[PDB]
Design a protein around this ligand. Structure first.
Ligand SMILES: [K+]
Ligand SMILES: [K+]
Ligand SMILES: [K+]
Ligand SMILES: [K+]
Lengths: 587, 587
């Protein structure tokens, strides 16, 4: 009754600049950890020559890159913002795009719940000084405080709602999703942006190996392996857009998976060393999440573990999951994504949750890598869990696909969330052949051309995408920006041709160069221009003039254009951010 | 005897990127202080809106620019070096060029004495950590420690001698020049590099006015004015090359001025507030400097004062100078360069000293600016000093031109140095009409082209420069660098012709493209290739082969080329440093 749908997703991880790259890497079992030479590391002069220094890390490509003009941010402010502020702000923009929701036109309350690492801000620059209360002081505070990582999203995306920032160490992503779902179930918001960000500073840096501790000795992470010595430190970002399941189905959204239940607790007085799971407290967390979503352990066929790669910590976590599943659970696939990318800190739980969501969406199970000798002490044949050594189709005897993801952190933080595969797709009516308007807008002309190239490339990969879904998503899911482009077409092949080249071969492009659009033809609505009659909305000349009026900069009511058909929102390419490098120069 | 010659100079001050630009500004009474709008200052968020905040400073253009390849420095090391390390190192290279001395061919011991501000390094980056003793740690120490500002000059220029760094607050330049002269008079070195550097961090910054203090209320410095309220903070660098006067005349060097005497002391227990000159202690300093050089107060016709611009501080200094001059001194021109540029900290005494050296060299007196109401409390008609309101030719009733410069700082630091005009130029033998080789070398082709552009402009400005001096200075006073250019010409007008355009219209260019050089034509010497006869060294075709062999990278003995003539070293354009910005990214 309290299911929450994941209708948009955005992430960046070691070796992946977007979610499609991340899922493709997981499918092929790639390792995203980077190894450096001594001269490639320009910090830790005192440690670089130690025999225990491991020159390996999970780097985040473009951690210092940002496109402030798209957000209305000045260059001065972009350098003042911590890298976590910028990376999370850019991911929030992308997650609204992936769900095809224009924040300017969202009619409801949107909550932004995120988790961040305050240690990064303390290393990036000195904190704000509150000796005076001028507007330049407030700008500096909004650039540095972790409290405004979520607030700046509401402000710069044009949303209205509530913002909550939490700091929960290595359980950050799960705690954000947990609090977001409480906001939705109590009716405080209509949809929620939830995620976390982790940018380790210094970025290009190794670590010091110490025997018996969580950091790996060779730079490789080997979950559930007998020869595992730990993990690698990683950076990344992961954001999801959450919406109640009945509403997401009613609005014909694109659903990756649904959140059945979440649970949090703390080890408390029953404390362990770092990474060591206390069986009683962690199992209560795992069982509580399954109880919240009314799912029985017999129905959960995938378990995404924390999995540092240490024999003792991996053994305790598998034991805790066993206590929560019981004996009669059956069989379940177990894996740990940390073998692929390392320990991503605040967003470590996000890497597992995003992997499980895409696993449920594509009905595939990605492998766990760096596993050559199974840990005999765990005794997997005596447990419900089977290590996923190879990729495989997900066809459970249970009948339903459900996953559980666990996040462990320092300070005793525990968290577990349970996901279910998305609802079965409804039968679609055949697509009407009629002229449609498609729109693209960006900040400058060069970015619009990148959007056209990105859109044409996407069309080849997704040949089964309907045109009425494409136009509906582009027209109602993107912000209207100054440099604009539009076309009126009827088939997918016409769309591919007008996008090609300079993009000026379409009737709308030739219309705008010859004559200006006559607005007296249209009727004014509260949301913009509309056509005068229902018959006019199938006339090529009427639709061409309306699209040209939009290209000239007028506001068009796209809701009434698609009012007669029940199209679906689909996932389209993100904005092609021009990524200038920004870094503070004064401490 | 005990007189020390200034045979080379290099400086950068507010509004001047080199000494020629600096003297031209002083001659025209220009002010080099910069005034900013609020949005142009990106620091001091807590103060930018205060009514007492003055958006004025003496900026040092390119304080972050460096050309590490010219010095053999890596990009990583260039970012680790503090701006004072880079600026002073670049200035030492320039002072060797200005004096026409190639460090590879200097046979003697060179001392490097500099003054620096340790406050600047502590603001630029965290200090080195000595928990281990690796080579990367040693590189970081040499990049940060003030002790290595002088060592890096000796190492990176290829010199051998001694290096001494002193910290004497706002009298740093004088203390460096003072110690250099003791080093020369005791015979420990043959030439000495002396100077100071001041790079204020943050650079683009205003200041806070406090009533009754040294900082100006409107951003203008008005020395000796009744309405003066103080000075502005400035950054800069000034370096001079010192050599005993009898040797400098013997080696036909280029002499700006000579140092007659120097003196230092401290206020000690008889302390004052900042900027206030104690009459008894400062006068003893001024009198001691003139006694060291055996100069009588009757002969000093120019006094360059500290002159903050406050009536009370100006009154104490003019009185202290009066006590040292006595009654029988006569009349003397008094001025303060701080009215032009502000208080340059470590190098403030250098800005006045460099002004005095150029005044003696050009036999001209530049005016003191921002002076509208003379301070009536300073009974100027009853003193030997006359405020230099207008530029004027320097023709003293004394018969000899001598100047005195005072530098005051915090902590009681006092210093005074007395300069004399250079010796009268001797009658020169007429210039031989013969073919000459001229050479230019840098690290890449674009820099060599900049050298050609700089030399073509210089030839127009200095139409009285002899061609045999130009060739002598370029061939024997500049380091041979990988990217090379040479020409064989007989007059100044053909020299201007080969430099023009792409520089490939010359005789040497056609030889190098046609054939590679035949080394069998030349005789090998310990200093490089030489021509077979003295007649060949005056043959256009033989000189072309020798020059082309040099452009191809062979070593040429330029000493035997000029052995028959006794030419002079002259001042030619400095290296055209590629202006890349380097700044640290991790604290
Ligand atoms: K709980
Ligand atoms: K109308
Ligand atoms: K700066
Ligand atoms: K003394």
């Amino acid at each position: 009754p309290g299911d929450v749908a994941i209708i948009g997703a955005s992430c960046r991880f070691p070796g992946a600049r977007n979610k499609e790259q991340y899922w493709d890497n997981l499918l092929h079992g790639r390792e995203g950890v980077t190894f450096y030479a001594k001269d490639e590391i320009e910090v830790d002069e005192t440690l670089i020559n130690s025999p225990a220094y491991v020159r390996a890390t999970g780097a985040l490509d473009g951690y210092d890159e940002f496109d402030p003009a798209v957000f209305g941010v000045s260059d001065r402010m972009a350098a003042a913002m911590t890298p976590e502020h910028r990376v999370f702000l850019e991911a929030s923009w992308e997650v609204m795009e992936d769900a095809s929701y224009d924040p300017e036109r969202v009619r409801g309350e949107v909550g932004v719940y995120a988790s961040t690492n305050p240690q990064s801000a303390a290393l990036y620059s000195s904190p704000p000084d509150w000796v005076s209360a001028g507007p330049e002081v407030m700008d500096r505070s909004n650039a540095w405080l972790p409290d405004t990582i979520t607030s700046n999203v509401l402000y710069y995306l044009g949303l209205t709602g509530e913002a909550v920032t939490v700091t929960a160490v290595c359980s950050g992503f799960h705690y954000a999703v947990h609090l977001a779902c409480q906001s939705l179930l109590l009716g405080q918001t209509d949809m929620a942006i939830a995620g976390g960000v982790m940018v380790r500073l210094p970025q290009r840096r190794g670590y010091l190996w110490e025997e018996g501790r969580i950091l790996s000795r060779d730079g490789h992470c080997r979950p559930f392996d007998a020869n595992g010595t730990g993990s690698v430190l990683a950076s990344g970002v992961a954001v999801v857009l959450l919406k109640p399941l009945p509403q997401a189905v009613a609005d014909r959204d694109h659903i990756y998976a649904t959140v059945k239940g979440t649970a949090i607790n703390n080890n408390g007085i029953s404390a362990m060393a770092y990474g060591l799971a206390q069986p009683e407290r962690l199992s209560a967390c795992i069982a509580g999440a399954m109880q919240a979503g009314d799912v029985a352990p017999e129905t959960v066929s995938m378990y995404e573990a924390n999995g540092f790669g240490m024999p003792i910590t991996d053994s305790l976590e598998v034991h805790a999951a066993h206590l929560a599943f019981g004996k009669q659970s059956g069989t379940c696939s177990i894996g740990a994504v940390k073998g692929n990318i390392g320990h991503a800190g605040v967003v470590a739980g996000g890497s597992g949750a995003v992997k499980a969501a895409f696993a449920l969406y594509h009905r595939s199970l990605p492998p766990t890598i760096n596993l050559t000798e199974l840990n005999e002490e765990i005794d997997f044949p005596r447990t419900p869990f089977v290590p996923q050594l190879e990729p495989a189709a997900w066809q459970p005897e249970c009948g339903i696909r459900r996953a559980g993801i666990t996040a462990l952190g320092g300070g005793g933080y525990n968290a577990h969330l349970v996901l279910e595969e998305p609802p079965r797709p409804v039968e679609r009516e055949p697509e009407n052949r009629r002229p449609r308007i498609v729109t693209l807008s960006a900040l400058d002309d060069a970015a619009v051309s990148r959007q056209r190239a990105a859109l044409s490339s996407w069309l080849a990969e997704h040949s089964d995408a309907r045109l009425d879904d494409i136009a509906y998503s582009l027209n109602l899911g993107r912000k209207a920006l100054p440099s604009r482009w539009a076309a009126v077409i009827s088939t997918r092949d016409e769309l591919l041709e007008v996008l090609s080249g300079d993009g000026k071969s379409g009737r709308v492009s030739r219309f705008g160069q010859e004559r200006r659009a006559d607005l007296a033809r249209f009727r004014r609505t509260e949301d913009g221009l509309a056509l005068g009659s229902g018959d006019e909305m199938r006339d090529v000349q009427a639709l061409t003039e309306l699209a040209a009026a939009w290209v000239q900069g007028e506001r068009v009511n796209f809701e009434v254009l698609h009012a007669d058909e029940r199209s679906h929102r689909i996932s389209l390419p993100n904005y092609p951010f021009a990524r200038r490098r920004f870094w503070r120069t004064d401490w």
